[PDB]
């Protein structure tokens, strides 16, 4: 309806996520089911593949398994992830990587995706991915995964938070295209710029 302004049927379901996500930022300081796992130690086992070694660059990819351990030493959950180094930004040649992760808790599942700036994370910045719950008590939830690689061991130990909270009637997304759209919508708030304007009005490979 309206060739002029055709938005997909799922648009209201995506839009509903945005006030919930901002409300989570204010409620995540202290009704709904709220899962907060603060100050986790994330033990990562990383398997990196090089396209054209010994240089990190486009075509590199990795898989990883994470165990999430709370300060009391208890495993609260696991994660399986995969990332691909995709391109260098036209503006400053930063390596842009995309990740997809599957989280497993004792009583359910959730997933993330998002962009990482290669330069930023080597400097010790926080990385943040939006979470959509996919099963168990998490299925009706949205949230945020925040990790910082420890300066001691930046590829094996991370400091990590996981925050998820129920939204009324749930996010209602099951189709992988809607889920991906939801993860991009929320990722806009927390993710790096994919390709800033260069100034010369040209997106040249650097």
Which positions from 11 through 70 interact with a second copy, judged by CB under 8 A? 11-12, 14-15, 18-19, 21-22, 24-26, 28-29, 36, 38, 51, 58-59, 61, 63
Residue among 128, 127, 135, 145 nearest 171 (CA): 135
Using CB distances below 5 to 8 A depending on partner kind, what does residue 18 bind out of a second copy, Br ion, none?
a second copy
Helix (H, G, I), strand (E, B) or coil at 86: strand
- Following CA atoms 113, 106, 165, 156 in sequence, which dihedral angle do they give, to the nearest 10 degrees? -40
Shortest Å, Cβ 70 to Br ion: 20
Residues constituting the chain: 206
Residue 123, interface with a second copy (CB under 8 A)?
no
CB burial of residue 173 (10 Å; 0-12, 13-18, 19+)? buried
Separation CA 142–CA 20 (nearest Å): 8
Residue 41, interface with Br ion (CB under 5 A)?
no
Specify whether the CB–CB gap between 160 and 146 falls below 8 A.
Answer: yes
Binding site for Br ion (CB under 5 A): 1, 100, 153, 155-156, 197-198, 203
Binding site for a second copy (CB under 8 A): 1-8, 11-12, 14-15, 18-19, 21-22, 24-26, 28-29, 36, 38, 51, 58-59, 61, 63, 80, 82-84, 86-87, 90, 98-100, 102, 111, 113, 126, 128, 144, 146, 161, 163, 176-177, 180-182, 184-185, 187-191, 193-197, 201-205
């Amino acid at each position: 309806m309206n060739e002029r302004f055709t938005l997909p049927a799922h648009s209201p379901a995506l839009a509903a996520l945005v006030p919930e996500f901002l409300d989570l930022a204010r409620a995540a300081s202290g009704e709904r089911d709220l899962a907060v796992w603060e100050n986790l130690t994330e033990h990562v086992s990383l398997d990196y593949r090089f396209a054209n070694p010994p240089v990190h660059g486009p075509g590199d990819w990795d898989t990883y398994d994470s165990r999430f351990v709370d300060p009391a030493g208890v495993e609260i959950g696991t994660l399986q992830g995969t990332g691909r180094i995709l391109y260098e930004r036209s503006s400053d040649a930063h390596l842009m990587m995309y990740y997809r992760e599957q989280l497993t808790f004792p009583d359910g599942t959730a997933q993330t995706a998002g962009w990482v700036d290669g330069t930023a994370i080597l400097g010790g910045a926080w990385q943040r991915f939006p979470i959509l719950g996919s099963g168990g008590r998490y299925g009706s939830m949205i949230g945020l995964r925040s990790f910082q690689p420890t300066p001691e061991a930046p590829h094996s130990l991370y400091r990590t938070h996981l925050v998820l909270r129920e939204i009324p009637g749930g996010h209602g997304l099951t189709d992988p295209e809607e889920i991906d759209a939801a993860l991009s919508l929320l990722g806009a708030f927390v993710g790096p710029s994919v390709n800033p304007a260069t100034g010369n009005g040209r997106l040249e490979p650097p």
